[PDB]
Every structure is written in C-alpha cells, then in structure tokens.
RNA sequence: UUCAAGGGCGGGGAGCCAUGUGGACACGACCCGAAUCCGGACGAUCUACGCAUGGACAAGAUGAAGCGUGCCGAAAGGCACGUGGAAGUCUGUUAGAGUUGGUGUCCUACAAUACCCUCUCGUGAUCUAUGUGUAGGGGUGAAAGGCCCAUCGAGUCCGGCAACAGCUGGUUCCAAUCGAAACAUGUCGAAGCAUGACCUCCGCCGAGGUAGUCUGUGAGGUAGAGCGACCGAUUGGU
RNA sequence: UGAGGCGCCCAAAAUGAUCGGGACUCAAAUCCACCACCGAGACCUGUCCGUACCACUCAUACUGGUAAUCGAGUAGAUUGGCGCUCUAAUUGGAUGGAAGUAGGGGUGAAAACUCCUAUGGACCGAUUAGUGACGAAAAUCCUGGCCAUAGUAGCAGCGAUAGUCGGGUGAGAACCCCGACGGCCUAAUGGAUAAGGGUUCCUCAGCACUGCUGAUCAGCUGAGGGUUAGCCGGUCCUAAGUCAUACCGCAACUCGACUAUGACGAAAUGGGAAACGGGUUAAUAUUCCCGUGCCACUAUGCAGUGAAAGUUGACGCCCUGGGGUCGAUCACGCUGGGCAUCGCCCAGUCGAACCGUCCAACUCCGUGGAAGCCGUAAUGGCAGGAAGCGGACGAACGGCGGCAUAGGGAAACGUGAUUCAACCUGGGGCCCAUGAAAAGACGAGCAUAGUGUCCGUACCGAGAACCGACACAGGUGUCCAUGGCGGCGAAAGCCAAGGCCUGUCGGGAGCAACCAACGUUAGGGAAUUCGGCAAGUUAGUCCCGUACCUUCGGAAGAAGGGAUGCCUGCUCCGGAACGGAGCAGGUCGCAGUGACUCGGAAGCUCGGACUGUCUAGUAACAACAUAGGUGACCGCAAAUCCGCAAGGACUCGUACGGUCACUGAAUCCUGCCCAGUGCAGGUAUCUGAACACCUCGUACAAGAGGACGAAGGACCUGUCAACGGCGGGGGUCUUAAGGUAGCGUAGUACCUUGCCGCAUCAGUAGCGGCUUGCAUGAAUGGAUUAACCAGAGCUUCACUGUCCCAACGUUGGGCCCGGUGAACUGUACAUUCCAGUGCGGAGUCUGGAGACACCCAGGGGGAAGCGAAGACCCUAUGGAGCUUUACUGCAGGCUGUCGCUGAGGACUCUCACUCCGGGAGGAGGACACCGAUAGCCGGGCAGUUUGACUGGGGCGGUACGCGCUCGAAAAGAUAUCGAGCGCGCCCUAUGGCUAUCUCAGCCGGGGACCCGGCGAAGAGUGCAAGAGCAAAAGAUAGCUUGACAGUGUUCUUCCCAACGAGGAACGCUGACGCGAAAGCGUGGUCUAGCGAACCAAUUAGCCUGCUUGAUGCGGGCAAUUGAUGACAGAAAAGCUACCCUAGGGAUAACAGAGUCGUCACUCGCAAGAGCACAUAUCGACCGAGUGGCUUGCUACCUCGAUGUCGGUUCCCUCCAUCCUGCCCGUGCAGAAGCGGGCAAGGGUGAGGUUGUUCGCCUAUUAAAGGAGGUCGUGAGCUGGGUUUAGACCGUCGUGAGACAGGUCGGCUGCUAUCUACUGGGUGUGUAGGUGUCUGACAAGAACGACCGUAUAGUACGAGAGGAACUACGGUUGGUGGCCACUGGUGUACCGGUUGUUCGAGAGAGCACGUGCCGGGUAGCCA
C-alpha cells in the first residue's frame, strides 16, 4: 500500500505546515526580576490570526512593547499589572497562590515562568480550587483537576472571544478561509470512499470499513485510523 | 556381516599420457524472442497540492441587514414608502476559466487529444503570471488508482544484464547405409523430464535361430448354445 | 393363390440443374454368360550407376563374379566427399594481363571444377598438413539500395473565401515593386512589452538549399554593418524559501534535521535617489545631438549645532461622495481640405520635465452657545459644546505664472462647456479570514566645483523569429478597457487610425454523380428514433397580470394579455447632458427589439440538499467535497504523525484546542441485539519468556527440573452514531436479538409486462394505489422536503424536412489543365462466374459456364480486404497491484530483565540523568531517556505459496494409494468422470497344533432340547467380490504362543521390459509348540488393510572424537517406533473489470462444420368423437421419416483477431402458400366458412410499450405467410442491449472483491492494388465510306390488387339474409415518361425596410457567403 494521509502529514511539508510568517506573536507571560512593580497600559486591541480571538496590545514601563492573550473586559487605556503583588482584577497575572480561590483565570503556566500554557482559546478558563503551600487545584477546561505549583503565573478572567463556536461557518468557503490559516490540510476525504491501496478503509464495491473502527494503542502508524483506542462507542448506554 | 548359516564387495598383472572426435554437467552455452525484480542516479520547464509576490473580472438584474420619513399604538411594536447595497446570488461568448451534446468535421490530421456549433462558470472553496517547497514504495491527490515533462495499480535514465522460461520463431554445402516413436513405469507430472519399448553405431561371443505350416504334449470359457445344470430374471392354465 | 426380377408412389429448401460433362433407351442402363482390346515406375527384357558380398590384391586402386531372396522414407544414428579464410611445407601462374564482373563453351549424380570472349589492371593458385567470427530463401530477422503503388492523396473545408486593371524590373513574373479600383483585421491581423529565441535586425550581392506552386522576393545563401545611458532596467533591499561555514549525526559521504553566522533569493509584476522636448540614422536612442531640468556623493565657503523622537517606505475585500487631467462630445471663432441642386462634412486650431504658487478632504485651535437643531448618496453629530464665524495643519501626474521672440506647424497657431480614465482626497460596511519585509527617504539650509565606473540595450514577441520534429488551424504573461455610430455594454453589426491581401499554389467546365457546410420547401406535424438525436420555436424594453408549493429567502421573466416605427409640437425630473420619464396630433409598411442583439413554456417521478470537485487524452454522474450531525484519543515532557540518528510537523497552537474516523443542509426521527469479532476496563484462580535465585548434573560447562511471574491470554464487565445481525418452527430452537417509525414491484421485487386505476386507437414505459418486501429499513442512517442541476425516466402546449418523400438552390471540394508531390500495401500467378472438392469458409484443385485488349468515373459485394504476435477463454511449477483469522518473516507499540545506577515486598533520599527557569534557582530523579535482551500484539511493510485430474475452465466429483467381478474380444497385456462395490482395520484368539466330529435345509417320533432318516455342501470360514475347503481349511474340546530370532532364493510391485517402499511363495540357520509319527505352525484359506531421506526416541553388542590419560558430552555400524492419503513424500490462502507477458484454435464464447436427442414439418396404422356415421372436420397410441429455423452435443477450422445482438438500408432466393389465379371435398341451399390440391407472377403495409429478436396490443387490409443468403448486409449506417476502465442498490464474503441480479455514464480507424458490378471512352479483330436494318441471345412484374354501379334486392331461401357470368366507373401499389395546369425552388430579378459608411439628396458597400421581409421568370422538380 502507500503511505496514509497520517503519515504525509508527519513530512511536515508546505501543505501541512501553519503559516507561521503570518502569526503575529508568541503570547507568553513576562520574565520580572522579582518585587513585581512591572506594569503597563493596554495600547491597542488586535486579532490574533493564529488563535482566532482578540490580542490586546501593551506598552511596559521599562519600553517593552509586547502583544498579549487578552482576556475579555480590557480595553484601551486599561492598565494591567504583572508581578507577585499585582492587583486582582481581569488582565493581570500573578502566581496561583496570590489568587483568591473561585476565581475564573486563563493562560495558566504548567511549569512556573514557562509562559503560560493552560486555557488558552476562545472563551475558555480554568478555575482555582484548593490552597496549600505545595499544591493549588485548578480545574482546567477539560474537566479534568490539574494539581498545579502555587508558583505558577495566571492571568484572571475569561479568554475573550467567548461564544465563537455557537454560529455555524454555513458554507464552505467559511471553513475554507479558517482552515486557511492553521496548519491543517482541509478538505477531509472519508477513508471508507479510498481505495484499498490508500487507506485501511478503503475499497469494496459500496462504502464500509473493512475491519471493525476500533483500534488498539499499539497498532502501528499506517493502521492506527478509526477510533482510537475507544473505551466505548456510540450514544446508548 | 557372521553362535551358525546365508549373502555383499574384490581376486589368475594394464595402465598412463598425447592428438582428433561422440556425449554429459556448470557456466550466456546454437541465435533472437517478455512481462519482471534489484541498485545508483536524473527529473515538479508538464502536472498535483501548498507558499511568496503581482495581475484580472463590460454591463445589467434581484434588492438582505441597517437607517430614514409617515400612519397607527400607552407601550410593545406594526404597516407604507424611501434609503441602503448584502450574496460561494441571478442574466451575460466583458476578460477569463471550464468542457454537455452533435456520438458532426478530422481520424497516413492543421493537431501523438485539433476545428466548428451547442453548452457551463464568470466577486469567489474564483481565475492567472512569476518565484518557491514536496521525489519514486516516495510526493501530490474535494479520491478518478487521478497526477508526478506524450512515461504511472509504483516516473525516467544507466547499471545488475548476454535475467530466466518446460512457451513461439529461426539454425546456412553434396552424397551413401540403416531407419523410428507418437507407447509403458515414475514425476507439483500431463506444452516438460527420467527410466524402459523402439532406431542407430561399435566391440565381443561362436552355432544355432524361428516371422509361416503340420503334428504332439499343455493353458483357456469369448462366439454360439442352454438353463428338470447352478443363478437370477421372466408367461399362463386346469 | 404362392414366389421371384426390374420399375412406380411414399419424396419439401434456399445464387445456376446435373451421373466428371456431353449425352444415352432392342442402351452408352441393369442382370446372366462370353470375345477382343486399351491401360502403371508393377512384371519381363538390353545397357549403365550405387550399395552389399565373393575371387585376386598392400589397396577401400584395377579386373572378374553374385544379389528371385539389394535400391521409397520424416525424426534420428553412421560414413565418404564439395566450397570459403589464413598458416606451413612441396610446387606453379601473372602487365605477352592476376583477382573480380558480364555473357558464352565442357566435365561432375552433386556440392562444384574448368575453359572461351569482353571488362578489368594487380595480384592469383595447386597438392599435402593445419586453421576457423567457414556455406542462408526464411527468423513480423538486421543495414542499404530499389520497383510497383502514382504523376495518385495533400497543396479546398477554419466567420480572415481577395483580389482586379494598368505599369515598373528582369533571361524568366498570377503571387517582387508602383497607382488605381476592390476587400480583410477593431482586446486584434493595431501599438508597447515579459519569457524564450539568438543576429533572425540594416545594406549589398545571389537562387544550389529552405519557402505546400513560382519568385527577380525572403526569416534562405554569401559578405559587410548595426545595440552609445549619473537620472530606462540590472545593480541595492528584503519575501516564500535556498545555499555556504560551524556544531551534531552517520560505517561513511557529494547524505541528514536543529541552532548559530554569513550569503543568496524579485529585469513584464514587491520595495526603490534623479529627465523632459525637439532633432537625427539604412540600422540605436528617456543612451547620440540641441535645449532645458533633476538626483547622489565629495571638496571648498557660509549658515547650523541641531539629530532622534517621530513620520515615511507600508499594504485585505465590498459600497460610495468630493477634487480632477487626457479622451470624447457640444457652442462659437480662426486655418486647411472635401462636396457640388442643398449647406453640409473632415482635419488642425500645439507646446514637457522642472521651478514657483493655489487648496479641496481629514485633523486640530479660538469664538460661539444650539435642551432640538446641524449634516449626508448613506451611516450619522452635539452642553464631554451643535450650526455660524476666524484660524493652524494640510492634495493631484490638477489650476495658475515662468520654463517659451524653447520647440513644433503649410496655416490658424481658439475660447467656453459637459461627462470625466489617469492622478488626489474622504465616508461607510465585512472577517470563526485580520490582509509582507527590509533597504532607503523624511525629519535636517544654501553657493560654487568635481565626480557619477560596471552589465543589459539589435530584432521577433507569434495562423513564419517562442514550446509543440514543420514557416504546425495547438499552446504561450503583461499594459493600451476612453477612437466614431450603436446600445445597458469592454455585446452584435458598420467605420476610422494603424496593419494586411502571407490563416500564401494556380487555370477551366452553369461547374454532372457523390461529400462537407448551409438556405427554402406545399399539405400533414414526432407518424422518425433507444430517446425530438439534429433542427426549429421563443426572444430586446415598458405596461397589466401571475398558480401549486415553500425552509418565507423563493417559486417568478411562473403562466397569460397588451405596447413598440417615423414626423410635428410639447410637458415632467434634474444644474445640465449630445441624460431619463411621458403627452397631443399627423403618418408609412405584410412586418417598427423591422437587421443585429435577443427565454420556448407547463406538469409528474428518481437522485444528490445548495455553490464547488473529478477520471490531462471515450465516464462530469447519483461519484468526491461541503456546512450540519456523531463517536474516538489527548492536560501539552500530551494525543497523532515524520526521521537510521542528530532531530522534526502539528505549534508564534493549548480542550470554544487538534488529532483520528463515520455520516452528509434544514425538518420528523434514528427501534431491538454485547453470542462471534474489535476496542477498553477488571480479575480470586489458571496460563504466561528471559535474567537473577534454588535442585540435579558436570572438579567447570553444556543440559534437566523447580520456585517467583510482567504485558498478553482464559475468565468477568463495559461498548453498536464499533464490524455487523434483526430467522425457522409452534400457541420455543440456531446464534445475541427476531424488523419498531417509516418506505416498498424500489436505480433494492426472481416470479414480472404483478393486480387495479390514470393516460393512449393501442403504453414491457411513466404516475397513483395495493404490496405477503426472491433478497426494504433507520448516521452500513430511515422518511420527508423548498431551492439548485450540461444528472436518469415520463406527459402536454408550442415548434419544426426527425418522418410521410423528397426537391431546388448557395459556398467549398469533387471532374479537366499547369506546377508540386508522399504513404498504406506487395510469396508467386491472377478476366472470372456457378457448383463440387479440400484442415469442414477456394480468383489458383475438379467439372462445367463465361471471357478480345487498354483506359476514365463510381458506390464499396469479395480477396474470411488493410491496420494490432486476441483484450475474451484456457495453458505456464510467468509477472504485478490488492486482501486476509494463507506460509514465513520485518518494522512499530506494550511488557520483564541488564547496563547507565548512587545513599538510606513496601518506603525515604540526592549526587548521576531529564526538564523548567536568564540566573539564583525549581520540578523530576535512580525512575525516565538511551543502549541490550526476552514475551505479547503486529498485512503498517517484505518475500512467497495457494497442486494435479477434468469431453475447455469453474462448481461437483477423485476414475490421485490399494482389492474384487464385469468391460476384456476363451494365453498375457488393455482405456474412458466405464457398470457393480469395497480397503486405510478387527482379532491373544478370530492365531498354532492335536483329538474328537460334520454342516445348511427337509421328514418322522417325544422355531429351545432329545432320538432316527434323507442330505457333496445350499452351512461355516471377521469384512467387498470372485475363488478354496467335508474322516476339513468348518464345529467342539484340550494344549500352545511359529504373530519366534537371523539370513536368503524366487515371483510380484512394474506382463512383455528398466524402477522404490510394500507384498507373497519357497528355503536355510537357531530356538520352540503340538502330534505315536510322517507332519503341521515363516499369523488369520487366497487376492485389500499401506510410507523414503533428515531428525528423535527406543533395543543389544561393538567402532570412534584432532599430542596424551581420566571424566563428561558427542560422532557411527544393525534394527524397531513416530508421516508425508497430492499415498515413489514441498512447510503454503485468495481478488484483479487497473491489469501485464509468453503461447494455444493442443482449449471455451461468437460464426462455420458434423450430429439431430431437441425443434419444425410430413407420412404409415386409425383407436376414438363427430346426435348415426374413423376418414366433412378433429384425432390418441405406436411406428417410419424429411428439414437444418431453435436448443443441445462434438471440439474439425481460425486465438501473429473471419468486428457483437437488435435495427436499418439494398439485392437475390426457398416453399412447408397468408392474399391473389385455377381446382376437389363439405356436417356444400344461399351468403359467410371449413379442409384439401396445383401454384413462388405479384403482394404481404402503418402504428402504442420494450434495446430487444420474440411477443403483447390498436386501427386499417385482398392478406397484413414463414424461412435462407457468415443467425445476408459495421473497408454502409446506428450504437439502445451484452461485455473494459467511474458509481449506486440488493445479495454473498472477515476482506480484496464477486454476481448467468438491477441501475446511470461510458470511443466506431483506412487515400481501393486485384476482383465484382453500374455507367463512360480508346484500340484491335471481322476487312473504303455513308445511311437503313437484321436478331443469335439478354432484361422485365410492367404490371399486381382492391372498391363501386348495372346484373339485383334478382338466382337460392320459410324468413333473415343474399350470390355469379358479363359490361362499366374509379382507387391503391409498382413502373416509365413529361411540366400546359397546381405546388416547391429559384443567394436571376423587382420592391419594402432596420444598423452603419460614402457630408445630405441621388445612388451605393457591408451585416456569410441574400441583413431581414414581400413578390417571383426560365429551368429543375412532385
Ligand atoms: N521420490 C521418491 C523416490 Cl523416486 C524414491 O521412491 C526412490 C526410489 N529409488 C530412489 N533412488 N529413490
Ligand atoms: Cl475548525
Ligand atoms: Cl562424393
Ligand atoms: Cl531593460
Ligand atoms: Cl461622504
Ligand atoms: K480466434
Ligand atoms: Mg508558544
Ligand atoms: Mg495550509
Ligand atoms: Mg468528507
Ligand atoms: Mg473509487
Ligand atoms: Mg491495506
Ligand atoms: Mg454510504
Ligand atoms: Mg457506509
Ligand atoms: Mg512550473
Ligand atoms: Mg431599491
Ligand atoms: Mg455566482
Ligand atoms: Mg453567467
Ligand atoms: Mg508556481
Ligand atoms: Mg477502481
Ligand atoms: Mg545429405
Ligand atoms: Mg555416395
Ligand atoms: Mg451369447
Ligand atoms: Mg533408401
Ligand atoms: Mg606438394
Ligand atoms: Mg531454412
Ligand atoms: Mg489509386
Ligand atoms: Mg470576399
Ligand atoms: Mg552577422
Ligand atoms: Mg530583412
Ligand atoms: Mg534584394
Ligand atoms: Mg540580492
Ligand atoms: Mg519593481
Ligand atoms: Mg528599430
Ligand atoms: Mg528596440
Ligand atoms: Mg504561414
Ligand atoms: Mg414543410
Ligand atoms: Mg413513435
Ligand atoms: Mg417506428
Ligand atoms: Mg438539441
Ligand atoms: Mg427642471
Ligand atoms: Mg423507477
Ligand atoms: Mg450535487
Ligand atoms: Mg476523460
Ligand atoms: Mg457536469
Ligand atoms: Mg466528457
Ligand atoms: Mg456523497
Ligand atoms: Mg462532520
Ligand atoms: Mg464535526
Ligand atoms: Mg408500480
Ligand atoms: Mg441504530
Ligand atoms: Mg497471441
Ligand atoms: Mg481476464
Ligand atoms: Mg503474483
Ligand atoms: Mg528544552
Ligand atoms: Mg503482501
Ligand atoms: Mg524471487
Ligand atoms: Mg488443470
Ligand atoms: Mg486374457
Ligand atoms: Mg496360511
Ligand atoms: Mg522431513
Ligand atoms: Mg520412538
Ligand atoms: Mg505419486
Ligand atoms: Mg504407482
Ligand atoms: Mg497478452
Ligand atoms: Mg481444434
Ligand atoms: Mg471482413
Ligand atoms: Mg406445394
Ligand atoms: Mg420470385
Ligand atoms: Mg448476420
Ligand atoms: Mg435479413
Ligand atoms: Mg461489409
Ligand atoms: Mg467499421
Ligand atoms: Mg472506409
Ligand atoms: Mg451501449
Ligand atoms: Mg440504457
Ligand atoms: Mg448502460
Ligand atoms: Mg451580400
Ligand atoms: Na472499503
Ligand atoms: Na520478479
Ligand atoms: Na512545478
Ligand atoms: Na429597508
Ligand atoms: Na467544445
Ligand atoms: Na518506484
Ligand atoms: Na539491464
Ligand atoms: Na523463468
Ligand atoms: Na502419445
Ligand atoms: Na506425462
Ligand atoms: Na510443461
Ligand atoms: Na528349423
Ligand atoms: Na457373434
Ligand atoms: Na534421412
Ligand atoms: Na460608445
Ligand atoms: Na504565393
Ligand atoms: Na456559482
Ligand atoms: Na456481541
Ligand atoms: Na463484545
Ligand atoms: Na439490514
Ligand atoms: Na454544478
Ligand atoms: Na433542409
Ligand atoms: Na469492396
Ligand atoms: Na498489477
Ligand atoms: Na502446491
Ligand atoms: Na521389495
Ligand atoms: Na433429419
Ligand atoms: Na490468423
Ligand atoms: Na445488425
Ligand atoms: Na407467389
Ligand atoms: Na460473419
Ligand atoms: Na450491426
Ligand atoms: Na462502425
């Protein structure tokens, strides 16, 4: 057989690389000596082409002048502190520990200074549980209760764009245009309607998977397609 | 080998070398004949998809939201007219792109994919130039096994290479003698082999031989016949 | 009355009859005898040759002899010889002419040798012994040359149809030049350029080459010449991205990812310091020259201390206002030209870069003070301060002044305006899309001077300069989009400017047939056809008006109805237009969107929601995509994926993410099943590798066992919007459940053209209903559904040459002439036709018939025409792509163990190691990573296998190893998918010996038992079948283990006749059993019951292992057991329609051929019925046949191809006759029929469903017969069906994929050499002429059929009803001819009229070969 559409994207070719000379900026917390006394003014509220939602514009004091993950509610001639003893309030970050519990944050770092990693699209947020000198819970988007450092920065409020994913793109074109603009090759032509030779699903003389769609984690690249090591399947039950 | 017996192999001196020649096996193996497989290279001037930087789209139609005015209403709002100018929107041989039917013309062509009429799209998932990226069990693919320079169910070039075939074709001077087998046994064997039958040639042996007939001593159950002779069928009558 | 001979009836086939033909009758037939002849290479005979043998001989040299008992031959074995090259030895020829070549003479059976003449002009032989890239008719053989083809095809076809008359030059002119007339091109056929080409550019001189003809011309040939830059490009900058160096990897590199650094990366078309005007050359030109201007740098001088913040470079899509130049147009003036019925029409009326100046818009400031005003095309603005007023900043490639008594013009050398490309400047809207960067510039003055190198610059830029082998009808980017009329227009049509007559061969025929494009056709109107394919209809604008349905958008231009020009005078909107909307009156035509441009409309159903995608080159679709729905994985040191590694994509990303899949808009919904399979989770117990550990073993080791036990598995649970399933039976069973909503004869329904209905004259169609559904059904998604569609089917109106049924015309060909000039094809011969024969499909064989030669044109009947070593089918121990629970392996994932690896069966720590963090330092941490190994999963990937037999192959079967009877032809041998049927064991006795004994069955006496008799065998003997057996081979009893060890002979396996294992018969040696003994026992009475090498285990003795001894553990001689049943032994599954190759007519489909069971038809007998009556009519059983249409069988012909079914068109035929003519019978009154005979002249038609053939149906009819010609007819057509590649549905399959199921789409090559015929000529023969005839023969259907009237309401008949002979009139079909008449054509002609151009008028051109409309002569036609 030939190489599945899994694996060509691995190459990282043209058609399946991000169009990274477009992005405009790596949005990631400061790096503050210490004593927090870091603070700037919200310049400018821009599109991020890479996320899809709003980055806001700031100029630090010390001349820095870098984009942010802005979370909803900043706006021009806002200021927005960064820094151990920063103040608590939407677009400010400040480290997990310094955080009042049942506060809605965003953009939450896994290892402290890494620059944020957790809750970072549209809408979503995490939110800060449990206290301790050791670990701080924080309930990530997902669900899922992340023990966290205490040490790790966090940004309070909301991701902004909140709501994107209520209207539907309609056509096709909409989703040509997204798609357009992240690392992802679209439009998806279904396995079961390849030929044997392209695809695990492929072949026949109607349209079917060969073989259940269930497949094990340790089925090789080439083969792992369908439903990945499902614990079940389907809606009843 | 063997208590033993019986068997196997060997034994009363002919070889070695040379030259010519018959045949066998390995090798290209009498010659040509095809689809492969493998290695290293050369190709994205075609084309597929992506990227960068540019360019293109007469004219008309429909008239979304929003806004305005007016009437009605306590309000909510509603109705009318106007404004507005949305759209993978419509008409359109604008430019440009595509390619449905004619199964027309052509079919040693104008052309190794052409001509004419017809037909579709034509502000968008649009078309297009140039630059640029992806390379061969690998790309690329809105998927047709499509496309990757007239080459694709695995490109092209050279090499491995004089690939192998039990399959088709061909294998060049004269004469004299003998003269087949198209069968048997085994065979992944039945389009092939080996071993026999049979053809030929050479050396050896040394007096018989037997294609015909008659007679003698034997073998035999086919034709025919018959079945109160077995066997099994198969009519009727007192 | 019996028998015989010969004949007759029975007796039907397709191009032209036959005994080979003629033809034959007291035979030239037949039968019985006979006589004589002809007739082979046989037989006889003369001579010769070869071979064999004999005598003589050294001899195979001579000579003599023998052959009645020698003389054919493919494959093949054997042997003597001819010829070629070069070597050697011996020996010769040649300039008094070698070799070779051409023609000719002689020898040899022959390969071949040799001579003569001519040519040639320098080498050449012989004998012997050697040598070898040593002998050709063939291979779709190779290379070269050449003939026919043939003076043939092409030099026509394209919406660009282009020329003509004079003249010039010249040896020569249709096409080279000049003038005129006439045309073509308008986003191009014009102008400027990119790439690419590369000198093609200019000049001179030429024509051997090239140029579709010619050429004096040329992109050709030769020689010269030609490209000038501070201010156009490059150059510089950076883009996607590329490379180099360092680092690192790799066995290694010319390899490889990341991170650093540096460099590269844009000539039309990214960014960017600066030039304009005129003039000039044969050829350059923002480059040269004249004039004027500008930029950068540097130097000097003055100013300036500022100088880096900021601005710029610098940016998406949509709508839109204002400013505004060119252009265009309008008014008017001037200069020049044109026209001449008028007073119009055309051209010009010029003038840069630059310097200076002006400033709308936006932004801001002051003033002011709006509580409702201000403002816009629109949104909008405001007490946080609206309008107004003043002001700061501030635009054009624009205005204005200079530039400029510069330049340019023959001259005048204008002025205003409107609409306004360029250019400038604003406002609004959109994004799940956010629309470069860097260099540079500005910021930041002025004078004067100096410098400003290097590379490109020609020309083409395309129906001749590029790519496509070509001067190729193809392909190929940018700018000119503002020239006039027209109109909505960058549309058509017409015309400027500019270009061209080079989409480059011509001349001639009223110019025929035929073909390509096309115009028009009366009446009818889809009757055509698979299907309205093709064509046609409709059309522009305004007014009125508009259904079902609908997701409320749409449907919709629904549909339907009306209007439309010109002229005169006006109104309204607007600042106005040379803008738009209207009014009144007048008025012409057949026609006013007058041409051109320019929708045909409506309805039902299927499918996919929509726009979009696709098989470059037969599929555009229902297929892919899509939004939408759904499930799965993952917290990022992630999931998924790439790399061998170093490393990398996703990712400047973070669950509202992105990966992996399914379904495929919206709406209503999406049932039941976890048994199998998959995935995932759990798990007492069971199973589960290696290391380590324990035991045995070994002075060690190999090795054997044990204990512990990971992932995995067993087991359990979860899960179907996972793969998939949703029946049989009865009022449960397989295997979990047992089909719910819906939909349903479906693109799924075999039966099937289902039934009913609608519709039609008629409807395998279509729609609706029913529906038991061969074999529908829910995200393998079910149902429904508006809109959309080059998607499939159907209906109606309209339309029409699709048809009835064809005609005429137009243009280009075609035909003739000049010039140019191929190809395909060719074993040979060839004037054939009818029959026959033959490998069964012959121009060539056989018999006849016909046939004088050559040539022109034609349409293609035949050469199983030409073209392609058949795609179909089979075969090959062929190939490849694909699949999987095929075989074997390889990656990869998970898991244990070892190493890195350290301190203190569960735990702490830090110091390696990893990651985060700039770092301090934090997280993690002996784990992870990495290296090694073990177990599991593992079509992700690789190599392969997947047998043979066979009335082709497959399915089935096994005639694949064995035994018996028969087949089998009285020895032996003997085939088939031949007939009957068996064996793959069983038995410790069912073996062995001995003793005693006789059985089946029947009878008689007291189905057990006892007694007698008859009883050669029918019993029994393990199991097929055949065979053997009676004091036994059977039965009973007793005893016994010979079913023993060893080694042979012979036969068999395998007749003859080689071959293994196996088997048997018969010995010997040893040991035994039984018997008195002879003797019997080498298993079972005989013929079936069986298996090699390698390896293991097993039995007993011995041989043996590398200097040597001991020990362990090995190697071996003999034999037993373990299986290969495909049974003389491989370890082994499938799909291909994506296919590929080698071959086969060794083998299938189609056609042919044989057969004829089948099928069609007939006959013999005649039961029976027909009210009686076999035979008017019907007709069984049985029996005998004919045909070659169906079907089947066979495997002869072709696989280096004989093109399919159906249809069509055109031709001939058969008769078994449907009609028509003439007859016979009748259950014949008549009329109408029924049955039969002769008979093939003619006829046998039109339509609805269906691809159909067939068949069903309708209405007409005299009747609407059947069949053959390669199931006649594809070098004739068509292409609906079968049967390629795409796709769907159902069924089947794990899957690839399959189907004798359905469905949508899906290509039709060739220039005719021969032959054949239709027609036309030229010659020869008969043997200078003119005119007229004859008639051997040949062709015809030239005529076939119907209706009507009189006969006649007659004959006949109760009546109803209702004939004929004959005579007439017409119709239909066919045929031949003709055009007065009717009709068509009529791009002859005349008129009307639209647009545009020539100024108007007059008169004309163009609008495709007439713009359109109306009329239409001749001719040709129906
Ligand atoms: N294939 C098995 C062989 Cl032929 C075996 O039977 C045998 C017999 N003779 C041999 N030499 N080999
Ligand atoms: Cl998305
Ligand atoms: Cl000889
Ligand atoms: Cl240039
Ligand atoms: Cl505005
Ligand atoms: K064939
Ligand atoms: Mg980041
Ligand atoms: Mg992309
Ligand atoms: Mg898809
Ligand atoms: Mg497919
Ligand atoms: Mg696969
Ligand atoms: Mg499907
Ligand atoms: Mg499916
Ligand atoms: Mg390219
Ligand atoms: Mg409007
Ligand atoms: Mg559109
Ligand atoms: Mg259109
Ligand atoms: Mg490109
Ligand atoms: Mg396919
Ligand atoms: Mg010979
Ligand atoms: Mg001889
Ligand atoms: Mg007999
Ligand atoms: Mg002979
Ligand atoms: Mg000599
Ligand atoms: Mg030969
Ligand atoms: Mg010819
Ligand atoms: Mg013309
Ligand atoms: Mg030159
Ligand atoms: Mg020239
Ligand atoms: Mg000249
Ligand atoms: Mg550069
Ligand atoms: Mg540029
Ligand atoms: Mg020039
Ligand atoms: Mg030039
Ligand atoms: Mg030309
Ligand atoms: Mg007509
Ligand atoms: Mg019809
Ligand atoms: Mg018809
Ligand atoms: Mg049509
Ligand atoms: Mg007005
Ligand atoms: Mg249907
Ligand atoms: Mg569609
Ligand atoms: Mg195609
Ligand atoms: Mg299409
Ligand atoms: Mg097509
Ligand atoms: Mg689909
Ligand atoms: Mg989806
Ligand atoms: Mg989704
Ligand atoms: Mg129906
Ligand atoms: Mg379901
Ligand atoms: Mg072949
Ligand atoms: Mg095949
Ligand atoms: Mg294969
Ligand atoms: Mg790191
Ligand atoms: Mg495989
Ligand atoms: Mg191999
Ligand atoms: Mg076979
Ligand atoms: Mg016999
Ligand atoms: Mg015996
Ligand atoms: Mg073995
Ligand atoms: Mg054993
Ligand atoms: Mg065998
Ligand atoms: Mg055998
Ligand atoms: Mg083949
Ligand atoms: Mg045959
Ligand atoms: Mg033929
Ligand atoms: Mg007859
Ligand atoms: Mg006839
Ligand atoms: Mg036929
Ligand atoms: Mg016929
Ligand atoms: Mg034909
Ligand atoms: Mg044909
Ligand atoms: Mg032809
Ligand atoms: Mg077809
Ligand atoms: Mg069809
Ligand atoms: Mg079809
Ligand atoms: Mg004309
Ligand atoms: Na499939
Ligand atoms: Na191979
Ligand atoms: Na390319
Ligand atoms: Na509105
Ligand atoms: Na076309
Ligand atoms: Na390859
Ligand atoms: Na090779
Ligand atoms: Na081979
Ligand atoms: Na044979
Ligand atoms: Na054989
Ligand atoms: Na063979
Ligand atoms: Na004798
Ligand atoms: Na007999
Ligand atoms: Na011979
Ligand atoms: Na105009
Ligand atoms: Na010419
Ligand atoms: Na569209
Ligand atoms: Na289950
Ligand atoms: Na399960
Ligand atoms: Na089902
Ligand atoms: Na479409
Ligand atoms: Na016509
Ligand atoms: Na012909
Ligand atoms: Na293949
Ligand atoms: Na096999
Ligand atoms: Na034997
Ligand atoms: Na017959
Ligand atoms: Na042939
Ligand atoms: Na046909
Ligand atoms: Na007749
Ligand atoms: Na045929
Ligand atoms: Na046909
Ligand atoms: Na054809």
């Given at each position: 057989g030939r190489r599945i559409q899994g694996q060509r994207?691995?190459?990282?070719?043209s058609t399946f690389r991000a169009p990274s000379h477009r992005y405009k900026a790596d949005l990631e917390h400061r790096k503050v000596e210490d004593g927090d006394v870091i603070a700037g003014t919200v310049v400018d509220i821009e599109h991020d082409p890479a996320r899809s939602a709003p980055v806001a514009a700031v100029e630090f004091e010390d001349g820095d002048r870098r984009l942010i993950l802005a979370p909803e509610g900043v706006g021009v001639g806002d200021e927005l502190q960064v820094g151990?003893?920063?103040?608590?309030?939407?677009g400010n970050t400040l480290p997990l520990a310094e955080i009042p519990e049942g506060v809605p944050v965003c953009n939450?770092?896994?290892?402290?200074?890494?620059?944020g990693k957790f809750a970072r699209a549209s809408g979503v947020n995490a939110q800060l549980l449990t206290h301790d000198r050791n670990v701080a819970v924080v309930k990530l988007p997902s669900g899922e209760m992340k023990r966290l450092d205490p040490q790790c920065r966090a940004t309070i409020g909301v991701v902004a764009?909140?709501?994107?994913?209520?209207?539907?793109?309609?056509?096709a074109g909409n989703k040509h245009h997204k798609m357009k603009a992240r690392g992802t090759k679209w439009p998806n032509v279904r396995?079961?309607?390849?030929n044997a030779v392209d695809h695990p699903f492929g072949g026949g003389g109607?349209?079917?998977?060969?073989?259940?769609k269930s497949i094990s984690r340790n089925a090789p690249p080439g083969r792992k397609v369908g439903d990945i090591a499902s614990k079940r399947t389907g809606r009843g039950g």
């Open positions: 994207r691995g190459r990282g070719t151990v003893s920063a103040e608590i309030a939407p939450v770092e896994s290892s402290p200074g890494d620059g764009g909140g709501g994107r994913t209520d209207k539907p793109f309609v056509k396995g079961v309607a390849m109607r349209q079917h998977p060969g073989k259940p």
